[PDB]
Symmetry: D2
Subunit: 386 residues, 4 copies
Amino acid sequence: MLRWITAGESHGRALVAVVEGMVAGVHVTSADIADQLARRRLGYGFERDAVTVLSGIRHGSTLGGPIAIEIGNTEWPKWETVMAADPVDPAELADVARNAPLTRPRPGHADYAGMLKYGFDDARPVLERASARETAARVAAGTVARAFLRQALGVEVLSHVISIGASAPYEGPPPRAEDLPAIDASPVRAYDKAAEADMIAQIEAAKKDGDTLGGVVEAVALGLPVGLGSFTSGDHRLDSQLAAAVMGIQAIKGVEIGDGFQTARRRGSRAHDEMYPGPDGVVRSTNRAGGLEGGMTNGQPLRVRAAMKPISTVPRALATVDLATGDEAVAIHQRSDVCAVPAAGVVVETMVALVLARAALEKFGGDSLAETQRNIAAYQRSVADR
Amino acid sequence: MLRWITAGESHGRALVAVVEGMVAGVHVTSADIADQLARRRLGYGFERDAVTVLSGIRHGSTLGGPIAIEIGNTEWPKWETVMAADPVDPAELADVARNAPLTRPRPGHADYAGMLKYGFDDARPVLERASARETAARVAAGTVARAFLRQALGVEVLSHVISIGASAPYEGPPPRAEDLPAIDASPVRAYDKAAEADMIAQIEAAKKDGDTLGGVVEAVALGLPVGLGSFTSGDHRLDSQLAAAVMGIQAIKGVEIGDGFQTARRRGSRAHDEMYPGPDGVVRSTNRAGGLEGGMTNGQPLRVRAAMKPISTVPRALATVDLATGDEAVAIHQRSDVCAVPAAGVVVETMVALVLARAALEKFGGDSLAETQRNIAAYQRSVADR
Amino acid sequence: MLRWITAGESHGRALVAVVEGMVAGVHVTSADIADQLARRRLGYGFERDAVTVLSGIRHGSTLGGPIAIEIGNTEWPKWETVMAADPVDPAELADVARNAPLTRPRPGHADYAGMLKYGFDDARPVLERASARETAARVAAGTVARAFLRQALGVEVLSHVISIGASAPYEGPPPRAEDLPAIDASPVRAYDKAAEADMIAQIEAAKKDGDTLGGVVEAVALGLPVGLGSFTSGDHRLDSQLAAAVMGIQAIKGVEIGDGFQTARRRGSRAHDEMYPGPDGVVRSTNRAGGLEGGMTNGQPLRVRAAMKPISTVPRALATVDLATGDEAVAIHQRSDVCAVPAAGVVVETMVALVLARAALEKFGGDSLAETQRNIAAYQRSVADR
Amino acid sequence: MLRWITAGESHGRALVAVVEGMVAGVHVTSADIADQLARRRLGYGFERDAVTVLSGIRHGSTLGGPIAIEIGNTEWPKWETVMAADPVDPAELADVARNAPLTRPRPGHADYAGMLKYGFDDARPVLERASARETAARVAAGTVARAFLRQALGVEVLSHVISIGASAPYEGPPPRAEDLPAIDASPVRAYDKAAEADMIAQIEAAKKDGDTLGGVVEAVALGLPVGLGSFTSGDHRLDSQLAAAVMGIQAIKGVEIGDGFQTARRRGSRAHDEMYPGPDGVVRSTNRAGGLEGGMTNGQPLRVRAAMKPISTVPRALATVDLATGDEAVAIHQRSDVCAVPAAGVVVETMVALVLARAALEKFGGDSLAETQRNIAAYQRSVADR
């Protein structure tokens, strides 16, 4: 089964992504990976294309075994001692200001709970793993999943920001032809020009106020066959899977499929997507469901929305405790950006792509892309021939 | 590791819940299970206490091995032939009206996608597993998780409905002392009298309109130690875990932790929960986070909200296709209730309890409750003694 | 992915087998299950055909969801109080001789380690789960795996005893046409008449000596396609998988694939199975490998051998400690049979079938047998057309 | 839960080991890793200490998150084009002799089955992942497991060769004080001087004959507490786990716990290890069981033996098919060593250590070593105080 693992501290030597269980014969290259990593850097307002494929890909074609992708820490010389893997003379570390203890947990971050959980007196070991720099590894891994999805199913995963801060939410989703304008081209990775203006204005105002913003992104997966995921068990549902993968993203506090929480406010009479005959199979004219019924892809665009809390600690605003003393403190921020919502959309795409590729491989099996594609073709014929 | 599995068709012989990985020495009884199953039947507006513990519990005390709980199909004599496990003379089945083919998938249900996914020409095999009757098995399993949580951690999981249909959402959570009034006592399992009136009115109006309703429930887990879940990986986060478990519930289309989607609209300056010294450890005065930071329990009430779409197909309202012919059809409903949101709250409690018990057992280990409790005590001392 | 779980105490109410992840459309019936359970009762020298399919199978055809199979405790009225799931007045249990404490662990059994592991003062809770009665649930589950294997791949899994006690081991494997004579027909489930005589003589002599015996069984799976399992990871290897599944059997202390430990004594020049052209693909003339190279099925019969220690405690022979007092004791036996090796062969078949079905479903995917079969056909054509 | 993954092709850029689920606070260093990797190079008759810890360890202390260890391909400049991750002009590759197709599968290796499984026309992609170079990553990962085991439990894992080729097997196990003499000091990593001479003679003779050898190694884990693993399920048994982990090793065709296959030939009267009182708890005077009863550690040395087939293809001895043509061929070898059994012992130690560390973390839980150690102490007191 497709599995992905991420390793790396934000300031440690390197990040690693390992993707296990991908079929041989999928075309992906380190350029594709660096491309997605660049997309992750999008948003009002990287470091660099040396990422390195360590294993699993040969001549741009997956080998069938584990694919390990390293992403180098571009400022490793700064962190070489502070985040040294090996022991470092504790006397030559007591001189290092960079190694000063972090004992004031940031509200909203892993710091406090992580410190108590692991018995750390310093938040460094926690924030190092917990930081959203980890999502770069996620994205390196999702690239394999995207390539597979495109090549096996003609599936495209994209995202667009629906709101940032108190902006007025957008309604009506993009296809893949729009990803270019959405992707920066647009500062807030907005599909809609009016929501874009409203969100840009939200960012300017929070920047000016010295504040930080969250937002809602929607990922959209197009071209998916019916019957990915299953209704046979709670955890087999794609719903469940997508929500795990998406909510596990740093700062994500909410997920919905299609109209989500708003569906919960509708009447059954207008909550669902009715079906009608077409030349080609059943057609629908709404997609309130967001492409999922009974935990399965239902032939409509998959739409996953995530709510991102503000991730950047606002500079001198948040009372905390200095865990060393028990005394009041002010939370010191680690990040300086007002808003990471647009890049969160790209992380969401990544998570969705991973789950989707795993589900596709579950149903269609195969050890090589050609074999999976044959099985996909046979399944599509069986659904067409009915 | 704690794992739970559900088996059973809604009209098949029995449901089974198996809970694997629970410690020996947890007090739970078939009466406790039947109690939770009764709670699942709550809501404006069972069958019966014979459920049977098959394995894993002796003299009301878990044995340490797999706990299998059967829940008997109370109307099995009606379904004995239609849902017979063994072959039945196909001629003596062509006479059975009950076995008539189901070829008109209900919009919103597993039917259509499930039929194509599995190559079924009949929705019966799909709706049988897919139906929310399966959540009874969930709840039988969650009972073991609740007992463990109470006995190991003094943790209580409860729920309350925040909205049904277009009711005006409630704000401010219950403790366990309120579960009695919330639990029916209240028809809509509302904590708040004013939201209760508004939701009851929503149900009356939809009933009168021949329509169906969804709603938003919040589960609340109180008394949890800091450091359940982990920030070390996306899937290790309790966030992720809770969202999988909750969104995997039939009809759930949205999950949020604490203020969720509303957090995404706030400024960092007021999005998070600041920390202050207390006699007893750090204290907070908000819980916007819903008891989770960096994927970990943070010492505040856990608050998980789920959006439930309307699950009961509205009688003659929804166009579908008769998959046999390709012709238009009207979706025939399987369920008759206007609203299952309050019982969804109890299923949500169950899912949350399961995830929580699993996470607790991950951190605190142990093979017997006494051992887990010792490890919990040692951990609580280490957090107190700092 | 195919998963199986077993629940039940040897004297508790019922056993349950749950098989999750099997495709819809596999023909299996409760008669097939009872048949395999009968085969498990084979051997020099059941209770009864009421086993009950609880879920997952309709009209003898798997539904695609979890298949739960109950096996009723035939002497439940004896154990109704001693192995009651619910609390029983402790005063009306102090009268029950059957409930007397078991504090003298049997050497070779789970008792001692299990007692300390779980903090039990009584071995009852341990021996209840630990007992090989649990393998009946295994076998109920393996039946689904066998049916799938036969119907999807034309694969047959059988076993034969190679040695019991100090008998002289047999060499040269059966096909499925021999299972009838091997299966009892033969008292020691021997393929070879001379090994049979020698093993029967071993049993008579141990019976006469009041002793107990182990033995070596070989399971054989015929008709497997090339490429089940994978070399991509240690745990992906079929080797690894088979060894987990087989060694996890009660009393199994050794597994080998093909010539196993004897291979380790050969020279590379005669350790492996050379390949030659044939009309039909590569052919081999040895199968020292036992059908596995690089963790994959290699087109030769799969041959898995298991070493079973004596499982029946020899009546007054084994010193132990009375864990209550710390004083010497003699181990009291729970079982009375001299030898269970032939039935161990049938359990081995079951484990092998389960692993094989899981591996097949991994490679060939599918949600319904027809779909899996199509994918298998496409794969076999791709291997034929080269 | 402790998990380990290996990535890398034998001639690809690097290997990676990722260990997920290890507690914070375990002392391990890249020197410790390089040490174990050196031990893996032992045996009649590395490259180099630059391995690199990428993540998860800071100042020689595990961080609690995933630990990624890279092992660099020391001859990467030779393989930079042939095993390039990215596309390489196919015309500038048709000139590369090194890239010549490998179409003659080696009997005993993954080549043939892997080629058909994955639809490869070349064995390169198969032998690259399948090769035992992968066990270097295993060993890098096992080092974390060893450090944890030593620091948490005072457990030591060692190995010794019991036989190579037709040597006469040794009987009676080492403690950790002997690892130095066993480890090379001894050419065949023999504990016994007489078995050593006999195995050295076996190697000389096969070398002289231009042949290759397998052998039997025993790993021994000392100091383990009672109750690791569980009897509650087949896969929970340590037996099962150890057999998966050990048999999944390249070239391993057989595993046994303690006296294994020989136990199967004994009478119950002398098959097991009787228990007696001691000042200190129960004592035993045999260890036929190899430290496991009912799938649990039983307070005796853990003894796991593995049968290794000859892994080095014997130069011109083995008929194969040229899969391109269908014509006869001779298998061309990839490796030149006569025997890798002693290093297999070290890989076995590694696998055993991994399984053991995972099992310990299951029972004793904890997020930091101090916490796990507290839980271990509490458990040991509960077993002492009875």
